[PDB]
């Protein structure tokens, strides 16, 4: 739980509050500073609870469906990446945002990007 | 769509995706990959839009598997991002990101991307 | 030049007319059945002119900037994939569409998708 | 932006991206990768928006490298998709797709995805 558990911020100022359970579980809340989002959204994910000891990062991923008590933007984002420990701990991710879409709009249903999370900002 | 998404799905690789869609918007179940450094079942967790649009749009969803179970650890995780489409054959169309634990020397090559489409029909 | 050179169609009905030069060059035109596009757009790309002989595909990629005489949608798409020969020849790709964007919109500037090209439809 | 995009660029890996932006919207030059199964320079070709927006938007562009030259063939190709931003430090922000020649058994693992950001300052 040690390294991952806590509050993280990405380059957009979004706020990633996560708890890494002993079984490999990620649970918490996400607050996006961008897009059709307000307040907190439930997140869930998984991480490698027994990572390699050769200096490589700890692989992980999590999902947010963009529905909460206030808004439903009919979309979901998954972050795929890894936690790296050290003087400047970091969660480096790439992400996919899929929106509900008709057949005619399916080609344009998915964003890709990359978020870097640190414990500052 | 609880009753629609809940069930056993298969992708074009023959992988098996056993999922339950709770009322809260949660996805829980197991994933068995027919490809790569995997064997037997792995825990998955995810989220879905529990109140989708009624205009004919699909139902957005995602889920994550960390490739560690009691038999194997491939020090990697895959996230699938996509949507459920109901109808004559319900389908789940995804794109996915597989990130492997990497060093600074290897980090540029840490992530695969691909696309899986799931149906309920056994291969 | 043999296998790749010709007219190809993807699952959206877009039309991919390409010539594969002996030096590894891809040149031709693209006509998209989707998005802010009309008529033909210039494409250029590269392919492995000496691929492996173990049965694997021939890696390739090409770019379209979405500006022609009629329209400019301030965006560019790159397809990355490979040509596979056989009874049903195929060009299997994934693609990235980046749109010109401000700092506030950068997070949402890029689509990802996948196109499969065959010599029918 | 012809004079802006034309020049020698470096990404966060130390790779060298020598490009000329023609008036037609074309990109031509050479790429030297600091990472992976590459050595010396490879041909690149691409396209860019020769008439970008004046609202503060970046200039969209893309280019392709096939990883074969006179010294090496890694049976793969990378496409970079991104945009040029001018200013105090001009920057080219990209995401990229590297596809390797694959078999049916290997096809699910054929494609890396990543992101490179280029400046003109030597590492
Ligand atoms: O804006 C949101 C939800 C908030 C997303 C926030 C994103 S998550 C990755 C990035 N990192 C963050 O921290 N924040 C941003 N959803 C819209 C997106 C645009 N939409 C479409 C529609 C059709 N096709 C494609 C896209 C409609 C739904
Ligand atoms: O093979 C697995 C675990 C099984 C994943 C199965 C994949 S999930 C998406 C697709 N859909 C499925 O149903 N099945 C496949 N994991 C890594 C280990 C090390 N790997 C890398 C890659 C890049 N850099 C470094 C190391 C390669 C793959
Ligand atoms: O529609 C086009 C150009 C035509 C693209 C056609 C695409 S190429 C991949 C797919 N395969 C095809 O055969 N056809 C489609 N460009 C728009 C896209 C939406 N735009 C934004 C703006 C801001 N952020 C993200 C996206 C504005 C520019
Ligand atoms: O290493 C290279 C050629 C050099 C590419 C350099 C890359 S371009 C994006 C990034 N930005 C840079 O500046 N440099 C790097 N090519 C393949 C060969 C076989 N590979 C696979 C992968 C997946 N499946 C099967 C085989 C791994 C990589």
Numbering used by the authors:
A (entry chain B), C (entry chain B): 14 to 134
B (entry chain A), D (entry chain A): 13 to 135
Q: How do the authors describe this structure?
A:
We describe here the use of an artificial cofactor employing the well‐known biotin‐streptavidin system to catalyze a Baylis‐Hillman reaction. As protein host, we chose streptavidin, as it can be easily crystallized and thereby supports the design process. There are several examples using streptavidin as the host for these cofactors, since its natural ligand biotin binds strongly (K d∼10−15 M) and is easy to modify with catalysts at the carboxylic acid group. No enzyme is known to naturally catalyze the Baylis‐Hillman reaction, a very versatile and atom‐economic C−C bond forming reaction for the production of various functionalized compounds and intermediates of active pharmaceutical ingredients (APIs).
We chose a derivative of DMAP as the artificial cofactor due to its low steric demand, which will facilitate its inclusion into the protein scaffold. The protein host around the cofactor was rationally designed on the basis of high‐resolution crystal structures obtained after each variation of the amino acid sequence. The location of the catalyst is in a shallow cavity at the surface of the protein. The system was evolved through repeated cycles of mutagenesis, activity tests, and structure determination. According to the presented structures and calculations the catalytically active site is too shallow to undergo interactions with 1.
